[PDB]
Short mmCIF file of C-alpha atoms and ligand atoms in Angstrom, two decimals:
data_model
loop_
_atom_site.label_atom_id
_atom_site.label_comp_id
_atom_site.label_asym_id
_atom_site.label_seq_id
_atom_site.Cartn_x
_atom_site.Cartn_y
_atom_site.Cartn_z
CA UNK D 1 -21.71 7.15 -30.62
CA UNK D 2 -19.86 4.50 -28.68
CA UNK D 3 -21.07 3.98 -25.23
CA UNK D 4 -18.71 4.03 -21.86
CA UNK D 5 -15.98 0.87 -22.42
CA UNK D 6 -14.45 0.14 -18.81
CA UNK D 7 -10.52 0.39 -18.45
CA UNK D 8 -9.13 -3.48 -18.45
CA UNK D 9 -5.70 -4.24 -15.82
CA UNK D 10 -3.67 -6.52 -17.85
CA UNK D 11 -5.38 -9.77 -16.49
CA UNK D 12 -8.39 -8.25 -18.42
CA UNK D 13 -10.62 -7.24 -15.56
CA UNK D 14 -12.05 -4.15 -15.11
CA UNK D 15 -10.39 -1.88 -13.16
CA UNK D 16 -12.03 -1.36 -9.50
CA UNK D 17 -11.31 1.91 -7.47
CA UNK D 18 -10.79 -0.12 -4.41
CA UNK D 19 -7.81 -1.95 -5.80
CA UNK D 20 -4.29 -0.63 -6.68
CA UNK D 21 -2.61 -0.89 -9.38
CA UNK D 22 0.74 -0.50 -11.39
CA UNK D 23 1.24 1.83 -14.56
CA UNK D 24 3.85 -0.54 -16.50
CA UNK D 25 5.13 0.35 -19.68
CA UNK D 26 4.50 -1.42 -23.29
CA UNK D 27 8.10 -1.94 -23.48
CA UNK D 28 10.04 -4.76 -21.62
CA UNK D 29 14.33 -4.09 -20.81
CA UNK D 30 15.76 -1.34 -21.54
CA UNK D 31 12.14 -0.10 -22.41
CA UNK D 32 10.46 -0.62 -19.58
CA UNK D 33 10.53 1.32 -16.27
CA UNK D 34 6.50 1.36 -14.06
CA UNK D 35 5.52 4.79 -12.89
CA UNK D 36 6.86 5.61 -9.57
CA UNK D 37 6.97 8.81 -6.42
CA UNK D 38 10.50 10.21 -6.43
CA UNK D 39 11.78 13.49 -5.43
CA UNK D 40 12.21 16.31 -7.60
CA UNK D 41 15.52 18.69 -8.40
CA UNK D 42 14.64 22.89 -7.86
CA UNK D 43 11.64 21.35 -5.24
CA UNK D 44 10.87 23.00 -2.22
CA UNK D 45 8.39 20.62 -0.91
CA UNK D 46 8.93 18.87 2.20
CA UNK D 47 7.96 15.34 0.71
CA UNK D 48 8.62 13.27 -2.56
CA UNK D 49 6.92 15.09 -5.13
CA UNK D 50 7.52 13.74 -8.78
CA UNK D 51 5.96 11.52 -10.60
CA UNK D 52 8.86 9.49 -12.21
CA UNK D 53 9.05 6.11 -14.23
CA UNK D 54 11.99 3.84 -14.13
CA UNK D 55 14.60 4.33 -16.69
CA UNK D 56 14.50 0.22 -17.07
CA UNK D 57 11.98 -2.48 -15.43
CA UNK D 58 15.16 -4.19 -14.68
CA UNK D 59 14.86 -2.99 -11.31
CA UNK D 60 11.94 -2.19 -8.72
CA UNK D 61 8.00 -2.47 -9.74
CA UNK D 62 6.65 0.96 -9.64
CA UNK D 63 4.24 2.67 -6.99
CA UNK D 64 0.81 1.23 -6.69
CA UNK D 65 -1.77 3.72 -7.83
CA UNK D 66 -5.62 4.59 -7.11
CA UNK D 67 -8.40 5.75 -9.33
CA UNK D 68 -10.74 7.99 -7.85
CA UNK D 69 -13.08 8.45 -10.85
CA UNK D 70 -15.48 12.09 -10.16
CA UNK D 71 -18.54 9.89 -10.78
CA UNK D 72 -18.98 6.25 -10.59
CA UNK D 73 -16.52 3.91 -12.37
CA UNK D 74 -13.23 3.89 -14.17
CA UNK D 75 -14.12 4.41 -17.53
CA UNK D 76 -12.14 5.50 -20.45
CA UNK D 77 -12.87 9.05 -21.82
CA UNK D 78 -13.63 9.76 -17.99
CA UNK D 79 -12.23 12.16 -15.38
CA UNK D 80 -10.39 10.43 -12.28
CA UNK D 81 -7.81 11.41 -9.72
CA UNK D 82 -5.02 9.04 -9.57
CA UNK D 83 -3.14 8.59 -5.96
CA UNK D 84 0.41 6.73 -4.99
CA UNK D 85 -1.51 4.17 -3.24
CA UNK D 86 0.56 3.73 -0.39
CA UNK D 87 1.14 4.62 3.31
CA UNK D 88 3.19 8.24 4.11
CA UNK D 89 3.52 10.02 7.18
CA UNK D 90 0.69 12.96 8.00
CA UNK D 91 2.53 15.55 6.26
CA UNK D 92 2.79 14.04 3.04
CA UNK D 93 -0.66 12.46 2.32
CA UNK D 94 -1.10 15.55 -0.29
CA UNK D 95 1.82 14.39 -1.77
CA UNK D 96 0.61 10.79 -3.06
CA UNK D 97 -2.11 13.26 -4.77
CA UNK D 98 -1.00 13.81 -8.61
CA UNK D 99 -1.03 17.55 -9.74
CA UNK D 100 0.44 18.81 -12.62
CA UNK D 101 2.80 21.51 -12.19
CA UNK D 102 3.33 25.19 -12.89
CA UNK D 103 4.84 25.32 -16.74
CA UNK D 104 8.32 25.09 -16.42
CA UNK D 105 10.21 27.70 -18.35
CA UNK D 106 13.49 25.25 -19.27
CA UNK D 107 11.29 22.31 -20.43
CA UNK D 108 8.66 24.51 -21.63
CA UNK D 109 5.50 22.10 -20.19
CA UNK D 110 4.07 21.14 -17.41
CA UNK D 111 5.66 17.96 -15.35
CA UNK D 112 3.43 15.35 -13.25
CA UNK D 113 4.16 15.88 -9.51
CA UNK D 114 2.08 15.12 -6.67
CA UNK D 115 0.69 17.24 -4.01
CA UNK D 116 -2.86 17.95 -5.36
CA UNK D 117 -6.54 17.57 -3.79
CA UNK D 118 -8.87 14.81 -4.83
CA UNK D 119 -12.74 15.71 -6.14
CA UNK D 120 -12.52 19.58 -5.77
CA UNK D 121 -12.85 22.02 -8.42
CA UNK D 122 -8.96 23.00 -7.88
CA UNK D 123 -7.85 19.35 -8.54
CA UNK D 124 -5.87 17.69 -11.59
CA UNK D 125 -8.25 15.91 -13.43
CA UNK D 126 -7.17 13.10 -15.75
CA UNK D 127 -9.17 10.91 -18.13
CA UNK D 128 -7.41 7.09 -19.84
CA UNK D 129 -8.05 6.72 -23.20
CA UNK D 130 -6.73 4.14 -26.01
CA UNK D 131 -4.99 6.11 -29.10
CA UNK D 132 -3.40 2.73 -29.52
CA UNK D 133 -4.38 -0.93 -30.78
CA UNK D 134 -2.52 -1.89 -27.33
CA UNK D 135 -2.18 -0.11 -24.29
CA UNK D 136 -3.59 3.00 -23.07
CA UNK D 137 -2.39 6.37 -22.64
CA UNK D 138 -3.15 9.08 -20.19
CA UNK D 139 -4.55 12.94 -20.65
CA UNK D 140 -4.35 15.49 -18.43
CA UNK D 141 -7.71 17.51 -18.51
CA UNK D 142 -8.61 21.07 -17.14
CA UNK D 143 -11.81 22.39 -15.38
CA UNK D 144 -12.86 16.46 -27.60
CA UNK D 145 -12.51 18.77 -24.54
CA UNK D 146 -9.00 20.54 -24.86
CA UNK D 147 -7.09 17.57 -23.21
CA UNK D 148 -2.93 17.09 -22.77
CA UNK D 149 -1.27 13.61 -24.03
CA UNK D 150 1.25 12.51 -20.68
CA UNK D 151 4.53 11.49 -22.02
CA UNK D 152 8.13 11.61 -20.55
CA UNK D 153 10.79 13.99 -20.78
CA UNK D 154 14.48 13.65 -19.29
CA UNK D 155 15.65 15.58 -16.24
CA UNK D 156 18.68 14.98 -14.55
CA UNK D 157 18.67 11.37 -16.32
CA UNK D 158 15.35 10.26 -15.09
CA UNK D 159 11.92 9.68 -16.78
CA UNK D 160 9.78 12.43 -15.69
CA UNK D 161 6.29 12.51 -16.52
CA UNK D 162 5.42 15.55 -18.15
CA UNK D 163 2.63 16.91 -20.88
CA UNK D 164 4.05 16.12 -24.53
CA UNK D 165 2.58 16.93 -27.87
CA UNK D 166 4.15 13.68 -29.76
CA UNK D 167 5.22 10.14 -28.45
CA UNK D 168 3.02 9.88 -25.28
CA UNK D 169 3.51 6.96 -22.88
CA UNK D 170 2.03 3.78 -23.61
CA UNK D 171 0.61 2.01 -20.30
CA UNK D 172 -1.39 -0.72 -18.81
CA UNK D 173 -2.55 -1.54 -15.44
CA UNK D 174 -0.93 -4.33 -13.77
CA UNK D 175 -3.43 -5.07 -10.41
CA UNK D 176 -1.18 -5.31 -7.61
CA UNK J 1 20.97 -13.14 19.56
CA UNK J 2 23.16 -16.43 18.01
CA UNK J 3 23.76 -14.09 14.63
CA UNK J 4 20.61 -12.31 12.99
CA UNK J 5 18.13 -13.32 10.37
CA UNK J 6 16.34 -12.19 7.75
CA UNK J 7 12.67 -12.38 7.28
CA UNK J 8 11.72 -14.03 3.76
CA UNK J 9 9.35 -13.75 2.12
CA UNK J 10 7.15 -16.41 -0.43
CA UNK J 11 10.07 -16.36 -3.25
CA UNK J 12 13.03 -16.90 -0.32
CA UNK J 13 14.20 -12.82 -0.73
CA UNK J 14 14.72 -10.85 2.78
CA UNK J 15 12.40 -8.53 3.98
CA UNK J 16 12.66 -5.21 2.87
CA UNK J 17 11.36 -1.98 4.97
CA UNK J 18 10.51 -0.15 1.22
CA UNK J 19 8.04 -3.08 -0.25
CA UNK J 20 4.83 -4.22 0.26
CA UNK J 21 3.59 -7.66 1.75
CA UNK J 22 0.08 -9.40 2.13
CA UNK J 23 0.25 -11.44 5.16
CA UNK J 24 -0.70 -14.81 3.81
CA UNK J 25 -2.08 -18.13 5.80
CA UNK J 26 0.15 -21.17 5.04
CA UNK J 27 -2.95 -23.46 4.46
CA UNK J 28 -4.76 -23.37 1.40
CA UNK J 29 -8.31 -23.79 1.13
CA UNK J 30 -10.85 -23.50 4.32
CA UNK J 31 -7.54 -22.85 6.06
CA UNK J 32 -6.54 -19.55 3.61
CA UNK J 33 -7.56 -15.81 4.25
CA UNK J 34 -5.44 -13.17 3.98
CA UNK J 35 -5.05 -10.37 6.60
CA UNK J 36 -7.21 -7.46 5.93
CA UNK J 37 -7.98 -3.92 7.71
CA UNK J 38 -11.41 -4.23 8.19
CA UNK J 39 -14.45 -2.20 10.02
CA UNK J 40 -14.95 -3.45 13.68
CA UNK J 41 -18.19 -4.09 14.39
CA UNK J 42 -18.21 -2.83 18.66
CA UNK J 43 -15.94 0.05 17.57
CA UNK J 44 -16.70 3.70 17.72
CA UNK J 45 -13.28 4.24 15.44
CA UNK J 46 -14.19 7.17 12.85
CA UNK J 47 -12.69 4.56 10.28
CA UNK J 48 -12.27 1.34 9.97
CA UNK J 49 -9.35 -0.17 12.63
CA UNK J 50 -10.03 -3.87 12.79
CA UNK J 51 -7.02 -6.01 11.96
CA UNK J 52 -8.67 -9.52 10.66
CA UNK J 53 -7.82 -12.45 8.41
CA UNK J 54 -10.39 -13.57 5.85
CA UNK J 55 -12.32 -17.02 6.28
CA UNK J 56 -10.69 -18.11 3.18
CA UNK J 57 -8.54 -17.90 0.74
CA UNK J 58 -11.48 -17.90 -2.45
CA UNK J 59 -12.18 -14.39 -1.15
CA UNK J 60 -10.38 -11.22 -1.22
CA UNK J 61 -6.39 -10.97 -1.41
CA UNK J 62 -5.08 -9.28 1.42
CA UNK J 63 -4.65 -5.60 2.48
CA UNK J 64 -0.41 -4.98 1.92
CA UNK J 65 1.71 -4.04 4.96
CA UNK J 66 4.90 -2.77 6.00
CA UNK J 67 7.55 -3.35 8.31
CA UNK J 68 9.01 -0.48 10.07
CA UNK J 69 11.90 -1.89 12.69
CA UNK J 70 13.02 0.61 15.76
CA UNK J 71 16.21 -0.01 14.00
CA UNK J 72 18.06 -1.31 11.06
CA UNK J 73 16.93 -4.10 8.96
CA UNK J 74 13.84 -6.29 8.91
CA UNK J 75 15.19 -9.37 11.47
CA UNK J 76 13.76 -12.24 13.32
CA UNK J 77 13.95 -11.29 17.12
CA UNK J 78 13.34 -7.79 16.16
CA UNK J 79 10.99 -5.34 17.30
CA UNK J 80 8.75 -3.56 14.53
CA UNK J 81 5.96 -1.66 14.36
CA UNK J 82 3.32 -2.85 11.38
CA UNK J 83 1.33 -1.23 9.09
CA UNK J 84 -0.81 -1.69 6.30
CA UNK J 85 0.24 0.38 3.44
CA UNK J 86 -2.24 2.36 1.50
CA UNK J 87 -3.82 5.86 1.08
CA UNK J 88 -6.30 7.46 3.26
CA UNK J 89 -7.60 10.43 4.38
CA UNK J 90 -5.18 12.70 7.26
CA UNK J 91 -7.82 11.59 9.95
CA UNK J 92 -7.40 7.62 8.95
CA UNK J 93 -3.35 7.48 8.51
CA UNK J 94 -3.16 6.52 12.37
CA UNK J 95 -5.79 3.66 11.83
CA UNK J 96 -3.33 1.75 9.32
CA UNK J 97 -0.74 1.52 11.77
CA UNK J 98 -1.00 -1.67 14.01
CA UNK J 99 -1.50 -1.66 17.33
CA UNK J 100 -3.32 -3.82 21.00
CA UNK J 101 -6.46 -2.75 21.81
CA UNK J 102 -7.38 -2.60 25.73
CA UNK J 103 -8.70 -5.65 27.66
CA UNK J 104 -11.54 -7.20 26.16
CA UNK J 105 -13.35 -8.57 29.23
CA UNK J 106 -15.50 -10.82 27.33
CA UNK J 107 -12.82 -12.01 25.01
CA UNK J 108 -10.01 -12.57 27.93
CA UNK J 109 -7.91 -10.81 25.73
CA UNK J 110 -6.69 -7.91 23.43
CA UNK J 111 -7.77 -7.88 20.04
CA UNK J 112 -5.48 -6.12 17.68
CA UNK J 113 -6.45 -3.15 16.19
CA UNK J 114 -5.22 0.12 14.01
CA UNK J 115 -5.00 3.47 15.43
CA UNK J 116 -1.73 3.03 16.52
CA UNK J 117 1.61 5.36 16.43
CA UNK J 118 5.38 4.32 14.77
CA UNK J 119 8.72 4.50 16.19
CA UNK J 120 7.80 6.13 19.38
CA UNK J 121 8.00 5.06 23.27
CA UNK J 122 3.47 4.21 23.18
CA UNK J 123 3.85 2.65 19.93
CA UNK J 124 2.86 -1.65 19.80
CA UNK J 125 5.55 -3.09 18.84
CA UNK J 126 5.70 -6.23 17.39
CA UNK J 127 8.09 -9.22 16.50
CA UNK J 128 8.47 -11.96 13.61
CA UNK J 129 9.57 -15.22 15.02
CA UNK J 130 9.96 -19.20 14.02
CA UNK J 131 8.01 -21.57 16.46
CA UNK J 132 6.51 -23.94 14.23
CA UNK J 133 9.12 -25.47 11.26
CA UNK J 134 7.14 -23.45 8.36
CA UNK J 135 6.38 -20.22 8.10
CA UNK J 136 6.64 -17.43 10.63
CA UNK J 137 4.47 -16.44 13.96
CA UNK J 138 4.22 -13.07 15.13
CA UNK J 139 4.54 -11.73 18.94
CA UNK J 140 3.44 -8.61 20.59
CA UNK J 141 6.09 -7.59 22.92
CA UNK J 142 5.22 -4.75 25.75
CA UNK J 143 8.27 -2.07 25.85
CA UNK J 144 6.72 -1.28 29.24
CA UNK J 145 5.15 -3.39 31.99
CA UNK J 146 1.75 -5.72 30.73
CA UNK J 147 -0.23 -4.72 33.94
CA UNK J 148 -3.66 -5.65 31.59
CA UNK J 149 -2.47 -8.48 29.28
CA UNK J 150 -3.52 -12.18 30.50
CA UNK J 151 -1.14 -13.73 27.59
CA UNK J 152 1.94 -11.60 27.99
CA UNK J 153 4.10 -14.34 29.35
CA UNK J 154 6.31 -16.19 26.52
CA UNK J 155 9.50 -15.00 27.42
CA UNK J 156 10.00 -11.37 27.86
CA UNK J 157 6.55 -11.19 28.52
CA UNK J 158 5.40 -11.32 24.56
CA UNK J 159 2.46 -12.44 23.58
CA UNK J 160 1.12 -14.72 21.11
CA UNK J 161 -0.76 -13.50 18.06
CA UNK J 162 -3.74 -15.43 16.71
CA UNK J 163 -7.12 -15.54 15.86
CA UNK J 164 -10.69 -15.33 17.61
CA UNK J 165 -14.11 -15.15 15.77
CA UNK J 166 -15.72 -12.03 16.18
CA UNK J 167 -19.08 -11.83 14.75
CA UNK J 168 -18.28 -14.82 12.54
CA UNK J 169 -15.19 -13.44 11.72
CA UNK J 170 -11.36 -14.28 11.80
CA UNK J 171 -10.21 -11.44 14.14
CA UNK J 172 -6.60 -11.18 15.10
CA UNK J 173 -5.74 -11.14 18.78
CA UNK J 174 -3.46 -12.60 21.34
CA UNK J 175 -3.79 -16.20 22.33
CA UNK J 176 -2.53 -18.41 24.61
CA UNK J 177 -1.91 -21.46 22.60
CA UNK J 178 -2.06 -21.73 18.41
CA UNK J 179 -0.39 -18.83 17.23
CA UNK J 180 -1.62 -17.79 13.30
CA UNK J 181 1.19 -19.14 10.74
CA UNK J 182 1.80 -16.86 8.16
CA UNK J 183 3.93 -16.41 4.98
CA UNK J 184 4.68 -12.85 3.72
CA UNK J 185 3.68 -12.25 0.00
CA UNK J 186 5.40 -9.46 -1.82
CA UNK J 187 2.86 -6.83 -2.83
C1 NAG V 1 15.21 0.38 0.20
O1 NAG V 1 15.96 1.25 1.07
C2 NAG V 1 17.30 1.60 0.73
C3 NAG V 1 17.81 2.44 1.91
O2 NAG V 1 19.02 3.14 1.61
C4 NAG V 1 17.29 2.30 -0.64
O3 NAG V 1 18.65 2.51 -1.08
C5 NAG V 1 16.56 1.51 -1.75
O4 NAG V 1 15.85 2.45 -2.59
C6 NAG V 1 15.58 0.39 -1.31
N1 NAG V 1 16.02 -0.89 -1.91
C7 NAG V 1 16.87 -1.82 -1.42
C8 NAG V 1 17.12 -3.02 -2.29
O5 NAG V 1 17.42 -1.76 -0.34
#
């Protein structure tokens, strides 16, 4: 019986669901690569719907994210939305919303995309725990309780987030 | 237009239309504040649509913008519309994008404001310009004629941007006479 601990960004504050953040690997090089909104193969939608990370931090800094925790504060253990925290056009405002997707029959899981609803009892609900000594990982949870590690796996040679069994992706949260 | 130039920002790298930038002060201290989208107090907006700059630079960091040109590339001399770039709800999206408010009787003046449209004949656009020797000013420059704008003069009738205090508070506006210096941060 541990109480609440607060999520820490990599400066060690807590992390504030008015600010925006970064999801940055453990791994520098060749290893790193922040979380970032790209567009999909096989995707119908109308706006950029995957949630990618670089294949190298060599590059661009990822998409600043939200937490939209269902009540209060960003805790770990605790259900949040997470949102691309950054300016679309009308039509796409659904699509800074992270979802997971329908299990895909090739890859045989479920990738992130966007395109979901915050605080509803449709939405994708994910909690940030630490598995680790450092870092954090994220879980995708339904409706402990029956949770999904987040890891990558590769689709047309990009990082795509998807739900994994082993080797799940090891994050922190850089405060933009 | 004696060959174009890039906007830098705070590490000497050009402008790009796919990052992020705080809109910074150039003095440190008393002098600092960041600009911010903040709620107007006199506006029946249904969200907040108050562009400001903070009273200094020990508060809060800034609320990150982007550039959109008409065309091309992010240029001195260049028209562009602005806004600040974050999530919101469907109904807000138009009250990140920067725009003039209407005559202000008591101020003499247009305050600037959100609520505005991109890349379209009635959006405000805006321009990113070198008076001073550091740092950058910015103009609002009417696409159509200024009938209601008392500091629309400059040269092809743009208008200073700067500051007036509105309820104690920085609020961005046009001015006659000193225009707010700014550096762009990357976000
Ligand atoms: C910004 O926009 C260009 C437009 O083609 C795109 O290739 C790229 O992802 C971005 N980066 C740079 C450095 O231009």
């Amino acid at each position: 019986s541990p109480l609440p601990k607060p999520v820490l960004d990599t400066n060690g504050k807590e992390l504030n669901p008015n600010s925006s953040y970064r999801i940055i690997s453990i791994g520098r090089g060749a290893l790193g690569g922040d979380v970032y909104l790209g567009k999909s193969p096989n995707s119908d939608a109308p706006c950029p719907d995957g949630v990618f990370r670089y294949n190298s931090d060599v590059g661009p800094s990822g998409t600043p994210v939200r937490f939209i925790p269902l009540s209060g504060g960003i805790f770990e253990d605790q259900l949040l939305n997470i949102q691309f925290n950054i300016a679309t056009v009308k039509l796409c405002v659904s699509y800074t919303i992270w979802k997971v997707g329908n299990l895909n029959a090739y890859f045989r899981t479920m990738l992130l995309e966007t395109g979901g609803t915050i605080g509803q009892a449709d939405s994708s609900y994910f909690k940030i725990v630490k598995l680790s000594n450092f870092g954090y990982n994220l879980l995708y949870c339904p409706i402990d309780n029956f949770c999904a590690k987040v890891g990558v796996v590769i689709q047309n040679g990009k990082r795509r987030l998807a739900l994994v069994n082993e080797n799940p992706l090891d994050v922190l949260f850089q405060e933009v």
